[PDB]
Amino acid sequence: AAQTNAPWGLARISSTSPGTSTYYYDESAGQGSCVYVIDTGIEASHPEFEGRAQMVKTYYYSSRDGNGHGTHCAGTVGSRTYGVAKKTQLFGVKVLDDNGSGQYSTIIAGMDFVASDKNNRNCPKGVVASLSLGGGYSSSVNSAAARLQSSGVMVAVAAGNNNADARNYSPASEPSVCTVGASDRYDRRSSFSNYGSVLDIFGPGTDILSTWIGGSTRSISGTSMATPHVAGLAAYLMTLGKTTAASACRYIADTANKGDLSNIPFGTVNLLAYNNYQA
Secondary structure, three states: OEEOOOOHHHHHHOOOOOOOOOEEOOOOOOOOEEEEEEEOOOOOOOHHHOOOEEEEEEOOOOOOOOOOHHHHHHHHHHOOOOOOOOOOEEEEEEOOOOOOOOOHHHHHHHHHHHHHHHHHOOOOOEEEEEEOOOEEOOHHHHHHHHHHHHOOEEEEEEOOOOOOEHHHEEOOOOOOOEEEEEEOOOOEEOOOOOEOOOOOEEEEOOOEEEEEOOOEEEEEOOHHHHHHHHHHHHHHHHHOOOOOOOOHHHHHHHOOEEOOOEOOOOOOOOEEOOOOOOO
């Protein structure tokens, strides 16, 4: 399938070169997979989600996304126009308040929630969790992400936006999950992207158009935007049968575009997420 005039990041993930604008992908499109977006919520009524999104858990007075961040990330996972995996099922878990903040204890509870809740959902092709959040190093936060991964969920987490080594942030620093840095449309490391040996992969993160609250759209930047590209890619590849939740991060690294990014510090992987789709 071909989506013309796609957001640059979608075009990038199906291309051996920057500078194109059509997204190419297998029509299976993540059908039969599920992606949990653990964030500020998801505006599931947005026409872009086509009834495939729902809130399943909140720790606050509403499950609504009063911020926009979670809706934007969910749109990059799976919206019809802005999403990587256009037929996945999206499940929102609201661990962040409408200011975008959240206690680590709530975030941990949300991760353990997903590890159990997947047993209440129909995801025959597999389960992914996208975590566009983080703070300073916490062994307990890392351990929660490790449990979620161990339980059979492909966990993708943001590297962070500090232009610093991600070893000092959580859950970015957990070795067993997929830690995602950000790149721009010219294949440069995004100016804010964290780096370091703990990164597994880069995805598009600068000037990413996606869904927003109030039935709208906007372009924003962050490793928060790169992470759902990778989460959606994992769901797409799992639906194709090419990999599993336990092996998808490694498979994405195996099949990535290699050596094409600029300003990657010595010791950080130079790998850009790529679907290897041959139309």
